[PDB]
Design a protein around this nucleic acid. Sequence first.
RNA 1: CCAAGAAAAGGACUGGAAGAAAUCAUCCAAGUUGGGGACUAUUUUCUGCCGUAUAGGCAG
Length: 216
Amino acid sequence: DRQLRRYLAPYSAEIGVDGAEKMALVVLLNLTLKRDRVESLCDEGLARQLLSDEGHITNCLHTVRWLHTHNLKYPDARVSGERLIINAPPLIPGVISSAGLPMRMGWAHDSSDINLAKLFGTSFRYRDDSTNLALQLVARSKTWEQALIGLGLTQQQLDIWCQLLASNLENNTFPTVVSPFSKQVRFLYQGNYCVVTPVVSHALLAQLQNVVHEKK
RNA sequence: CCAAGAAAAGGACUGGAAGAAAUCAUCCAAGUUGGGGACUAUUUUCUGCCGUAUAGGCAG
């Protein structure tokens, strides 16, 4: 059912997977293929086969390096450079912003990672909080690791991935230089001028897509 | 020191043909508008002559 793909989409409400970690790994791995090649996201065999392909998974692990909280390319695909990962600013009583929302990440690098990026960057509700596959494996979450080894992964392959997967989330969180296609505007601040560059919040935009259709 | 600064959407056209809304049908009954009254006020046009003359022309 297409409704499963809808509920796992970035513009839909998050769904719980507690006690279903085995089928969650199967569905999430199966999403890495083009829709024309998959008759069902529930086939354990296809998942066990995809998991054994270190190259396919390696190509998927590589997408983690560009997961972000704020998207510097949103209005204009020409912007080139590094990702941006920042905790939401303190709440201002008179302003609507990401300050009142929980932590979420998205993906945007070369435009050919639409399917391969879905294995680690797809979020879900777990232990009654918002998480994703990359975070549970980096944090050494045993329930997910036990299901993943059960689906055919060698302990030695997992012991190596925990390290490479974690490493991809440990650096390049702030751009080195201002990119040549970004916006720059200047105003007075504390008696002198400062240049401001705006950026769109992933969590805030994704929520708006749901609220306008539900609240009319 | 205005989500900063610059930007040519342009070219060509053929919707045409035919046509039958008809038949009948009844607005009636009575009715009471009605009593009073200053347009002349501080206003100008008055007096002689020619002429058969309330015609028609002139001096003050």
